[PDB]
Every structure is written in C-alpha cells, then in structure tokens.
Design a protein around this nucleic acid. Structure first.
Ligand SMILES: [Mn+2]
Ligand SMILES: [Zn+2]
Lengths: 90, 602
DNA sequence: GGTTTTTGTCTGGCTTCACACTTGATTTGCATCACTGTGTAAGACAGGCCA
DNA sequence: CACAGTGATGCAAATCAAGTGTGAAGCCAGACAAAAACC
C-alpha cells in the first residue's frame, strides 16, 4: 500500500520530500609508455590550459588528431630507450 | 590490528571472541562459522564493496581463484595426467603461487565417486527380474561369476563392467543440468516429473589389437543417450537430444573386455548378463531424484551400433560371404541383384530365434540344403536383438563402385565385346584412370573410399567421362543416371531428411525405381548375379530405415587409440586392476559434466 | 486464534566500478601447416573337399 | 586408404597504458504491515 499512499500524496503535499518515520506513521494509521603515450602525458597541460572542461574523449581525440597530423622523432627515441631499460629489468 | 601477528590478534580480540561465541551458541546453536561469514559479507556489502563481497561469496561457492575438485578432475582426466604427474603440478603451482589453485588427489577421488555409477539411489517399479536391487554397486567383474577352476572351460580373458541400470542412473544424473534446462527451453516447469522417455542407442565393436609391446584384442560394449522426451498432456515434447550421436565423447562405456569379437563362447558368456539386465529394464519404470523432485524414466533401447559382422554374429546369421546377403530381409545375392528395389524389412529377433529352432529341430525332415533355404541363413541361435542399419558412407561407396564399373565398361563398350578378355578390360580401366587424372585430377586407387566416391559422383565427372564415349545416346543415359544418384544422395546423407530435404525424401522411391529401371534397360551389361550388401540396402531399404530411425547418419576407430592411451598412462600395471582403471577412466571421460568445464571458454 | 518469522515500502546522499577515446606496439586466439605411423576393412589370394 | 595428433606457424583481434567525469548499481536508516507459517 505504502507506495500507492505516497504516490497519491505527491500532489497532496505540493513539492515536499516527506520523512521516513512520519510517513511510516501515516500509512500505518490509515611497461614503458608508447612514444605517443609519453607525448600525451607531456601535452595534457597545454591542451588543458587552453580548454579546461574538455572531456577525456575530447582531449584524447584532439591529442590524437593533432599528433597524428604531425617532428615526433624524439618521442620515439625516448620510447626506445625506456623500452630497452624495461627489457633489462628482470 | 592487521599489522599484528596471530597470537596478538587472538589476544586483542579475545573479549569480542567470547561475546561473539556466547551470542552464536545462544542464538544459532553454536554455528560460529555461519555467523562470522554472514557478518563479514554484510559488512562488505554495507561499505559498497560489492566486488570483494561477491568474490568471497564465489570462494564459498568455489568459483574464483580456487578450482572445484570436479574441474581439477575434468582437467586431469581430460589431459591424461597420471596421479604422480597431477600431484607434481599441484604441489608445484601451490608452492610457487602460495595459493592452492588445483585441489589435492584425495579431493579428486571424492569427486570421482559422484560421477561413477553406484552413487545415487534409485528404484525400479516393478523390481527388475533377476537384478539386484542394491544401488551402491559400481565396477563389477565382467565375467559375472564364470567358473575358473582347472576342470572348467579355460578362461583366457579379463573384463570389467557396470551393471547396466546403475550406469543408466549415472548417465542421467550426469545430464541432469541439460534435462532441466531443456525443460525450461520448451516453456515447461522445472518441477514436472511426468514420465520421461529415454531413447538409448546401444553399441558394440571389437577394438582390434590393443597390445603394448602377440595380439591382444578387446571388445567394448557401450551406450549413448540419444533423446529424452517428456509427456505434457498428450504431446511428447523433447527435452534433450544429443548433438553428436556418433562422437567418442557421449559413448558411455558399459563393459570392456580383453577378447576376440569372433570368440563366440567368451562373448556370449560375458555379454549375456548385460543383455539380461537390459531385457529386465524393457518392462519397468525408473524412479530417480533430480533437483529434489523424484522423476520417473522409462527406456527404449535400440541396438543400432553394430557393424555387419557383429550383427550377423549376435543374431544367429551366417558369415558375410553367405548367399543371404541382407540382415534386414531374406533375399539372396541372386534375388537382390535381379530384383533391384522391391524389398522390405522382414527379419526380427523373434523370427530369428524361431528360425534357429527350426534349423535345430528339422521338423519337416529336410535335407541340409532344403533346411538352409527354409531358415534363410539362421543356423545359430541368436542372443542379442539388433537394429541393423546402414552407414551413409557405405551408400556413397556402393553407388560410386557401380558408377566406376559403368564408366570403364562404357569406355570399352562391353555390349559390343561379350567375349572381351581380362587384358582388354584392364586397358579400359587404364584409359578411364588416365583420363580422370588429366581432367578431374583423380589419382587412380585400388581400394574404394569416401573421398574418391565424393569427387567421382559429380555431373562434371560424367561430362569428363562422356568425352571418351563415342555414342551421345549413351551420354544421355549416363547423365540421367548420375542425376538420379544426386537426387537420392541427400536423403541418406542428411541427419534429419524430413526437414533438410523433404522433396527428395518424398521422391526417393520414384527415383530409386527409375534408377533401377535405367540400369535394367540401358545398362544390362553390368548384371551378373552379384550385388553388395551396401548396394542392396541403398536401393531397397533406405526409406524404410528413415521411417524406422529418422536418419541414416545418426545411427569407433578412435576406440582402439583411446583404450590404449588409458591403459598405458592411467592404469595400474596389474591384470587385476588395469581394466578397472581403464573403464573408470573412460567413464569419467564421457561425462557431460566434466565436458562442460572443458568448454568453459564458450 | 496468538506467536513467531520473512520481505517488502518510502527517500536521498554515499561508495565502488565500467565506459568514454586515442595510437601502436605487444600479446592472445585460433586455424593451419607438413608429416608420417597405425588401425581398419576393401579386396587380392591361398586352399582343400568332392566330383 | 583416412586420420590422429605432434610442435611450429601466421595472421587477425584483443589488449595495454593514461587521463577523469560521468552514469549505473546497491546500500543505509526506522517505524511498520503484508503474506506466512509455528504453538
Ligand atoms: Mn567391427
Ligand atoms: Zn534387404
């Protein structure tokens, strides 16, 4: 019953959110990073500062599109170095 | 508290321990375990930590990071690991990961007991004739108390078996999950218990040389649950049917013996108790508890798994070279060759038992040839009721053999050369071989097989062979013959022709008659009083077999390999217990229950 | 009938994952390869009884 | 003959890894009454 009693009362009380106790009373009563990956970690601040509320999908989509359009050789160098370091790591 | 060690935590919680033990003993009868389990699960759920609470529930149900001993058993059995090997892997993985991912050997034995015959209780109403009512019986001696003294007949064989009813019980309990879910899938209620009918393909083959190195031969008597229907009102709705009837996987072993399938005395001695048990079950209901509810089963046994040699042996008939070429009818080789198609299924087990008695009693005092014609081949007493069928393979093979002979004879034009010599026909055969190699890339072989038949029975092959035939009038005939063959082939090649090819199933008799007519008119040269059992069955009995059995295809050469595998790797090297271990192992290996685990990645 | 239980009802504000999107270099999944030994049964072949 | 079953192979498809803001899903509390079995 209680669910029907409240539903009815949704217009009885115009907009009030009723209490649990009282309502009961009333019802009762009724790896190393990719080159691109290290790049994105470094470039997240530039993209973020220029657009602060960009979602993850949006920021990543941008980062990806502009870096895909690109120059990026030092990223691949750093990636290869970190790769062989991790390889050594046993 | 958690950075503390065991004695520390015991001390610093001793007070709450005493209070909790008091509350538990005073409210739940001392079931501290259930109280702590529910307390911790409820606390976890209270903290919104549903992941760890669910994983704890799964560890108590045994589903995550600890394999259920049944899954260990499925793996071990299904990978042929010995106990020594299995234990090595178990101890090693546990030592290196600290966690007991696989269960110990004693747990696997205990999980075995459930899956082996003799575990669940059951009843037969009325009690089975001459069968013990004990339900805790498992593996029993296959000799069934055969005398072994030096005076008696010499026993050269070791065998082990199940009691046929107990095995049926274990196989049903094994498939319980499929039965309930199939009941659901037909929009029926889980708790229904009305009489289920189980159809059971019964099967028997010799397994050749089993020896590990003298030949050591083995016979395997086995069964397959083919279909389980439930009765709702007055409709019989199927709740289960096996998808792969012929698989090694669902062929439940009943007895394994170390004997020759042609060693008649031993065979009857070992198999006769099993048949006695099956006879008993033919007139009784089985009461068996599934899912808390008692369910009732009744069985239909159909010995369709017997190749021709074993059929003839168990039904009292003569050896394969006989003139009585068919185990379904009384035709002779000459009759069946002259009379192409009009033949009907005649024989039955009872008719054979009476024909034996007639042979035996010679009531009309006839000579041996007259008596042999009277009983149409039944010179020995039958002792198994079979349902002799045909293999789709043999239909294709018999047809292809006939077409091959027709091709070579049409190249040689044998009607014009009635007194042609052996070497002229040989050159005809060579001509056809050469041209089939050039046009169809067919390596001539000297032993007929399924792949050759499959590639040769094509219309294009007929065009290729016509390229060597002068008369085009005979091109007409050969092409029509091959067209009729291609119309009849689906009927016997499908697994359910009443849906996959109903046009052809209907037209089958019309086509068979036309095919025989065209043979009897245009192709008279290939009549010489000889025909094969396979060809006779294909042209005379196929529609009758589909009427009886529903399919050709649905009703063991890995049997040998699998037997030898188990024996070598999973069995005690002692005559006393090797067969026990092999039978037990094969039985486990056919359980749908363990198979489900092995398929878990789907 | 009284005396005992199960299982709901009404909120929100909480906590804990899954998804969202990209890039490309790893990692898995899966079917396939080439290949002979072995079982099986299709089909040569040895054989002895009686005319 | 077919075919079983070996270790290798090769290509397609997950997968990983980072950022974090969502949305979904389940749970809490307290007075209390339905739908239910126990004397
Ligand atoms: Mn056989
Ligand atoms: Zn016949």
């Amino acid at each position: 019953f209680v669910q029907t009693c409240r539903e009815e009362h949704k217009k009885k009380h115009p907009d009030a959110s009723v209490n649990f106790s009282e309502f009961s009373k009333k019802c009762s009563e009724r790896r190393p990073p990719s080159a691109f990956f290290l790049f994105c970690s470094e470039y997240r601040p530039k993209i973020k500062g220029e657009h602060p509320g960009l979602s993850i999908g949006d920021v990543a989509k941008k980062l990806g599109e502009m870096w895909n359009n690109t120059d990026k050789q030092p990223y691949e160098k750093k990636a290869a170095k970190l790769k062989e370091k991790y390889e050594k790591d046993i | 508290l958690l950075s503390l060690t065991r004695r520390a935590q015991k001390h610093r919680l001793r007070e709450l321990k005493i209070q909790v033990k008091e509350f538990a003993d005073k409210e739940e009868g001392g079931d501290v375990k259930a109280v702590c389990l529910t307390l911790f699960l409820l606390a976890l759920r209270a903290r919104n930590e549903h992941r760890q609470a669910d994983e704890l529930e799964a560890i108590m149900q045994g589903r995550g990071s600890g394999l259920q001993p049944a899954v260990c058993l499925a793996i071990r059995v299904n990978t042929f690991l010995s106990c020594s090997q299995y234990h090595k892997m178990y101890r090693t993985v546990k030592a290196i990961t600290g966690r007991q991912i696989f269960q110990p050997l004693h747990a696997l034995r205990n999980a075995e007991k459930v899956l082996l015959p003799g575990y669940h209780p059951f009843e037969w109403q009325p009690p089975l004739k001459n069968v013990s009512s004990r339900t805790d019986v498992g593996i029993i001696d296959g000799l069934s108390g055969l005398a072994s003294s030096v005076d008696e007949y010499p026993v050269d064989t070791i065998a082990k078996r199940f009691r046929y009813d107990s095995a049926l019980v274990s196989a049903l309990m094994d498939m319980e999950e499929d039965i309930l879910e199939g009941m659901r899938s037909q929009d029926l209620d889980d708790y229904l218990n009305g009489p289920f009918t189980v159809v059971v393909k019964e099967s028997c083959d010799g397994m050749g040389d089993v020896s590990e190195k003298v030949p050591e031969k083995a016979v395997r008597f086995s069964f397959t649950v083919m279909r389980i229907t439930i009765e709702h009102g007055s409709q019989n709705v199927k709740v289960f049917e096996e998808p792969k009837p012929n698989s090694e996987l669902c062929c439940k072993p009943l007895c394994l013996m170390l004997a020759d399938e042609s060693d008649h005395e031993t065979l009857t001695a070992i198999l006769s108790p099993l048949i006695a048990e099956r006879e008993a079950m033919k007139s009784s209901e089985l009461t068996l508890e599934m899912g808390g509810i008692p369910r009732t089963f009744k069985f239909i046994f159909r010995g369709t798994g017997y190749d021709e040699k074993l059929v003839r042996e168990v039904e009292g008939l003569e050896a394969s070279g006989s003139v009585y070429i068919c185990t379904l009818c009384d035709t002779t080789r000459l009759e069946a060759s002259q009379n192409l198609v009009f033949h009907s299924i005649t024989r039955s087990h009872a008719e054979n038992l009476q024909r034996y008695e007639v042979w035996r009693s010679n009531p009309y005092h006839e000579s041996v040839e007259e008596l042999r014609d009277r009983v149409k081949g039944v010179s020995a007493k039958p002792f198994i009721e079979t349902v002799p069928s045909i293999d789709a393979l043999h239909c294709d093979i018999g047809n292809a053999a006939e077409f091959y002979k027709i091709f070579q004879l049409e190249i040689g034009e044998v009607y014009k050369h009635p007194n042609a010599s052996k070497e002229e026909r040989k050159r005809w055969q060579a001509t056809l071989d050469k041209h089939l190699r050039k046009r169809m890339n067919l390596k001539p072989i000297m032993r007929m097989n399924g792949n050759f038949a499959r590639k040769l029975m094509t219309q294009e092959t007929v065009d290729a062979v016509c390229e060597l035939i002068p008369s085009e009038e005979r091109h007409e005939a050969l092409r029509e013959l091959m067209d009729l063959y291609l119309k009849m082939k689906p009927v016997w090649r499908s697994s359910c022709p009443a849906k996959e090819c109903p046009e052809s199933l209907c037209q089958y008799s019309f086509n068979s008659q036309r095919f025989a007519e065209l043979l009897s008119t245009k192709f008279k040269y290939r009549y010489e009083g000889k025909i094969t059992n396979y060809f006779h069955k294909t042209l005379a009995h196929v529609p009758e077999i589909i009427e009886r059995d529903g399919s050709i295809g649905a009703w063991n050469q890995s049997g040998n390999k699998l037997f030898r595998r188990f024996r070598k790797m999973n069995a005690r090297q002692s005559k006393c217990y090797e067969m026990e271990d092999v039978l037990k192992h094969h039985w486990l290996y056919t359980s749908k229950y363990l198979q489900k685990f092995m398929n878990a990645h789907n």
